[PDB]
Symmetry: C2
Subunit: 271 residues, 2 copies
């Protein structure tokens, strides 16, 4: 039976669109108001039952490590000033039920190589993948929505979003047939199809629950290629999750996320 | 059938005996001539067929990571300064089939906590543990000697050696009975006994092949010796008198003698 307790977070984003701010920190450490992108994704994963966090690092790996590892000198300067809500902000980033490990990717070779880099830490277990640039604000954690489908259907699950047909050249797009109102069986995947040639308008977003059989298909490359090959052996579903995704891969999308989440969680309003 | 492919290296040694040098470097990064202690132990593990290296770090974890991760600017400065045979000493520390991952221990709480810290990376597999302060110079990698026993006899294996009775306060000491001329079946283990009350003079050194059932005994409630003792009650634990010379680099005296001896053997260095 399916138990998903490990999650892989590629956190070596170069973030060239955000240079020079990403000169000394990876893209996934840039904050939305007061919280790095990667912390939203970690909080989602932990809310969904993940206990083993696997960070795949690159340049400036220290920004990631220093964020999630304990910081005694900080907690010192904080509790000497009797700051309890603030200590909890730092110390309690992770519950004590949760552990992290770090693996350096050999070179920036894309998401399929980042996932394969995590194999020694995953073993022969299904596992999650979360791309922190896809900042999802949802009433129920999206990874949990995906895990629940993966356990019930017994297969890998890709998170998908309905997108305008005119925009399909921006995304990986599934070819799939409905099996219920939100979940589909995937038969093919196509990267950046022309709008009139796209098989659906269901775009892959950066939330995956993958069976460990994927690793052998990544050793045979791109993650979409490894999933395409996985389908020929095992079951792969897509699930149109309930939630609002902010694409923080662009400055525009990162800016709208700051506005929207600044408003909703911080009562910040533009002049 | 036993497959040992993962090895845990606790590398958060405070090395208070070596302060101030270990202020900004963990103890396991101190070099013996031209090589950090931890690289000798990694090279033994790799020669023994280990492919997944698991470093349990603490303070100054950066020195460990930067030593084993790639360093492109150094291959640059090497190519500009003229060297090229030096590239192999740097790029080729690890073979291409070997990977490293880093877990931070939650606090310096002893070897048993350090082993348990590696549990998420090891899973339900037998695994090796190597303490880099125990620098071992052997014709055959000691970890290989122990893994071969572990596979043949289907149990955990502690690396052991005879020590003077007077020194038993420094070691975990096994009570055991012989199974062949080098391997013993462990019946008990005692942490730092008084010389006159030590059950034997067979000391555990820092090489171990442990079955994954040890993790649950390290969670049951903290010392590695207690985990092994509990493991004995349910599973087989052997001790193996390995072939090789062990230098106790945990003291300044033992690190000094490793530098003199390996200086002589491998670098042609002789006190004047
Ligand atoms: Cl640094
Ligand atoms: Cl310690
Ligand atoms: Cl634990």
């Amino acid at each position: 039976h399916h138990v998903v307790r490990k999650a892989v977070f590629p956190v070596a984003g170069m973030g060239t669109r955000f240079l020079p701010a990403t000169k000394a920190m990876p893209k996934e450490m840039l904050p939305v108001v007061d919280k790095p992108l990667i912390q939203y994704a970690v909080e989602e994963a932990v809310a969904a039952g993940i206990t083993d966090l696997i960070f795949v690092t690159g340049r400036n790996k220290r920004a990631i490590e220093d964020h999630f590892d304990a910081a005694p000198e900080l907690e010192t300067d904080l509790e000497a000033k009797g700051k309890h809500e603030l200590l909890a902000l730092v110390r309690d980033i992770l519950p004590a039920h949760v552990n992290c490990l770090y693996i350096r990717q050999s070179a920036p070779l894309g998401l399929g190589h980042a996932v394969l880099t995590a194999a020694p830490a995953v073993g022969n277990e299904p596992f999650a993948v979360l791309l922190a640039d896809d900042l999802i604000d949802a009433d129920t954690p999206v990874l949990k929505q995906l895990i629940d489908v993966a356990v019930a259907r017994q297969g890998s699950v890709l998170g998908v979003q309905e997108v305008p047909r005119e925009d399909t050249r921006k995304y990986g797009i599934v070819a799939s047939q409905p099996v219920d109102a939100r979940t589909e069986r995937v038969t093919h995947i196509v990267e950046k199809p022309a709008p009139e040639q796209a098989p659906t308008t269901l775009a892959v977003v950066g939330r995956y629950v993958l069976e460990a059989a994927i690793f052998d298909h990544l050793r045979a490359i791109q993650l979409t290629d490894g999933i395409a090959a996985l389908l020929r052996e095992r079951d792969v579903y897509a699930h149109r999750y309930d939630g609002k995704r902010y694409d923080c891969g662009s400055k525009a999308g990162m800016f709208q996320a700051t506005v929207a989440l600044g408003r909703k969680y911080h009562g910040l309003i533009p002049e």
